[PDB]
Each structure stands twice: as C-alpha cells, then as structure tokens.
Amino acid sequence: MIWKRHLTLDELNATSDNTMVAHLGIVYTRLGDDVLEAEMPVDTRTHQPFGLLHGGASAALAETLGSMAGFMMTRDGQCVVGTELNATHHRPVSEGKVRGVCQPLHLGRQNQSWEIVVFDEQGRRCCTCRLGTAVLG
Amino acid sequence: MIWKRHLTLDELNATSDNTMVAHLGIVYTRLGDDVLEAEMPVDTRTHQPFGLLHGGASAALAETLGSMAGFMMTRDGQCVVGTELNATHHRPVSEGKVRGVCQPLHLGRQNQSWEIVVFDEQGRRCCTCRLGTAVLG
Ligand SMILES: CC(C)(COP(=O)(O)OP(=O)(O)OC[C@H]1O[C@@H](n2cnc3c(N)ncnc32)[C@H](O)[C@@H]1OP(=O)(O)O)[C@@H](O)C(=O)NCCC(=O)NCCSCC(=O)c1ccc(O)cc1O
Numbered sequence: 001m002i003w004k005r006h007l008t009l010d011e012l013n014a015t016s017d018n019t020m021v022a023h024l025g026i027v028y029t030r031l032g033d034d035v036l037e038a039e040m041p042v043d044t045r046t047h048q049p050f051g052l053l054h055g056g057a058s059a060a061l062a063e064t065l066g067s068m069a070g071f072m073m074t075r076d077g078q079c080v081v082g083t084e085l086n087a088t089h090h091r092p093v094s095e096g097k098v099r100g101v102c103q104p105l106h107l108g109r110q111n112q113s114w115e116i117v118v119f120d121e122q123g124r125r126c127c128t129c130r131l132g133t134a135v136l137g
Numbered sequence: 138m139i140w141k142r143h144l145t146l147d148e149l150n151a152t153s154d155n156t157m158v159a160h161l162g163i164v165y166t167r168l169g170d171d172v173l174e175a176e177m178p179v180d181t182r183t184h185q186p187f188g189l190l191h192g193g194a195s196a197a198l199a200e201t202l203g204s205m206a207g208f209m210m211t212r213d214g215q216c217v218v219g220t221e222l223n224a225t226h227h228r229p230v231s232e233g234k235v236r237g238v239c240q241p242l243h244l245g246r247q248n249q250s251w252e253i254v255v256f257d258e259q260g261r262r263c264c265t266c267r268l269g270t271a272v273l274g
C-alpha cells in the first residue's frame with residue numbers, strides 16, 4: 001500500500017482522544033491501500049443557524065482526514081502539519097450523516113497534497129476539498 | 138455601519154444556540170461599522186492529537202464569521218450561502234483563545250468575498266482565510 005505507518009481503525013479512532021475529531025462525532029470508517037474514510041453526523045453539533053450542515057464542519061472533516069493520512073505516510077521520527085486548505089460547497093446537507101473520502105494527489109518527501117470529497121447519505125457529492133501538508137524532520 | 142441588518146452582539150450570539158458555533162465555544166465579540174469578530178477557545182474542543190489548535194477549527198471560525206457577515210448584508214427574503222473557502226495555517230497555537238477578524242473584500246449583488254484573519258493572544262497572525270458567498274435571489 002501507500003502507507004508507511006500501519007495502524008488499525010481502532011488505533012485511528014483512539015488518537016481522537018479529547019480533540020475536535022471526537023468532539024465533532026467524526027469516526028474513521030475505512031482504511032484501504034490508498035484511501036482513508038470517515039463519517040460525521042449532521043445534527044446540532046455540526047449545524048449552522050438555519051439547520052443545515054455547517055460548511056465549517058465539512059472543512060474540519062477534510063483537514064482531519066488529510067492530516068491523519070499524511071501522518072501514516074511518515075517515518076518514525078516525523079511530524080505532519082496541515083498548511084493549506086480549500087473547499088468548495090456544492091450542495092447543502094439538511095439531514096443524516098456525511099462520508100469523507102481522502103486520497104493522495106502528491107506524496108512528496110517534504111510536503112504532500114490530499115483530495116477529500118464529502119458525500120451525503122445518498123452518496124451525492126456535497127463538498128470538494130484539497131489539503132496541502134508539511135512533513136517536518 | 139454597512140450592514141443591511143441592524144443586529145446586536147446579543148442577537149448574534151443567540152443564533153449560535155444548538156449549532157456548531159456554540160459547540161466550539163465561538164462567541165461574537167465585536168460588531169463594528171464594517172467588521173465582525175469572534176473569539177474561540179483553544180482547548181480539547183478544538184485540539185488536534187498533538188495538543189495544537191486543529192486547522193479545521195480555524196476554518197470553522199472563518200466560515201462562521203464570513204457567513205454571518207454575509208447574512209447581515211441581505212434584505213429580507215434573500216439567503217446567503219458560503220461557496221468557496223480557503224485557509225493558510227501560518228503558526229501553531231496551543232493555549233488560550235484565538236480571535237477571528239472578518240472584513241469585506243468585495244460586496245456584490247450575487248457574490249461576496251470576505252477576509253478572515255485569525256490571531257493568537259500575542260496578536261500574531263496564525264491563519265489567513267477567504268470565504269466566497271452567494272446571495273439568492
Ligand atoms: C511548520 C510550518 C508549516 C513551517 O514553519 P516555518 O515556515 O519555518 O515557520 P517558522 O518555523 O519560522 O515560525 C513559526 C512558529 O511555529 C513554531 N515552530 C517553529 N518550528 C516548528 C516546527 N518544526 N514544528 C512546529 N512548530 C514550529 C515557532 O513557535 C514559530 O514561531 P516563531 O518563533 O517564529 O515566532 C509552520 O508554518 C507551522 O507550524 N504552521 C502551523 C499549522 C497548523 O498548526 N495547522 C493545524 C494543526 S495540524 C493538523 C490537524 O489538525 C490534525 C493532525 C493530525 C491528525 O491525526 C488530525 C488532525 O486534524
């Protein structure tokens with residue numbers, strides 16, 4: 001696979017401890033050869049004042065996924081940090097939960113780029129994001 | 138002021154009820170003639186696994202501010218939605234609060250562009266964001 005670090009879903013959902021990831025109901029749901037996935041609830045934790053999925057929640061979901069993916073691409077003595085994020089909101093989400101699908105675009109030695117697409121519970125694309133990360137040391 | 142809607146901090150902080158805005162502990166601290174500002178905690182609620190401020194938290198604060206600012210430029214009936222978000226993470230923050238400052242770059246009839254700068258307690262710029270919005274109809 002692509003990953004340098006080999007971790008289980010249980011282990012991934014364990015780093016979440018008392019952070020924003022956990023705080024937002026984000027759960028890592030799949031780890032494939034070259035893809036990381038997570039789901040996140042659409043309720044009062046992730047709402048904006050009109051009752052729709054807060055665009056900021058999709059963003060945070062994307063930075064989470066890209067960073068964790070970045071982390072699993074590093075050797076034992078390295079850190080990975082999100083440096084650059086962008087996101088396009090195509091469709092509102094009023095109900096259910098969303099799934100984020102993160103895949104590599106560029107896996108460099110000093111920095112990387114990740115794609116994260118966010119789907120609603122009908123598999124409809126609602127948000128496209130890209131995260132650039134920095135590998136340190 | 139420039140806002141179509143004459144609201145108050147109290148009015149603004151009331152909209153946060155039962156949303157992601159309240160969940161992240163974000164509170165609007167300044168409503169100026171042409172500036173909106175909110176503060177957000179850097180604690181477990183907004184941390185990432187290294188005990189630093191989660192980049193997605195800064196993003197969520199930015200989208201909150203830009204959207205709220207954008208609503209306040211709408212005549213009754215109209216709605217405002219965030220469409221494009223970008224964010225550059227310049228500096229880590231680990232404790233205290235951060236402050237988001239939102240100002241208009243371009244106020245058009247169907248499209249708006251907002252700048253949100255996020256500062257740490259020393260007043261250093263930690264994150265720069267831009268939010269595109271859509272007015273309808
Ligand atoms: C590391 C850089 C990218 C480059 O550094 P630069 O170009 O040389 O800039 P300078 O070094 O010259 O000065 C900067 C200041 O920073 C300090 N510092 C210094 N060196 C280092 C270092 N090696 N490492 C760290 N800090 C360093 C110094 O105090 C220095 O201050 P000054 O003394 O100069 O006043 C830097 O811009 C940065 O840390 N951005 C923060 C982005 C961020 O936090 N994003 C969100 C969090 S990560 C994603 C996430 O949420 C996530 C992760 C995992 C997961 O599973 C799930 C998740 O969701």
Ligand SMILES: CC(C)(COP(=O)(O)OP(=O)(O)OC[C@H]1O[C@@H](n2cnc3c(N)ncnc32)[C@H](O)[C@@H]1OP(=O)(O)O)[C@@H](O)C(=O)NCCC(=O)NCCSCC(=O)c1ccc(O)cc1O
Pocket residue numbers: 048049050052053054055056089090091092093152200201202204205208217218219220271273
């Ligand atoms: C409004 C657009 C910008 C126009 O694009 P377009 O040219 O019209 O494209 P289409 O019409 O062809 O798309 C059609 C499909 O999507 C729909 N559709 C369209 N209009 C509506 C509608 N009014 N209602 C429902 N659906 C609509 C239809 O369902 C339709 O279904 P289909 O027929 O396809 O089956 C659009 O890109 C959009 O809504 N993006 C979502 C952004 C977002 O969710 N941001 C995050 C939340 S807001 C910020 C925030 O967090 C925040 C705010 C305030 C605050 O105080 C604090 C805060 O933090």
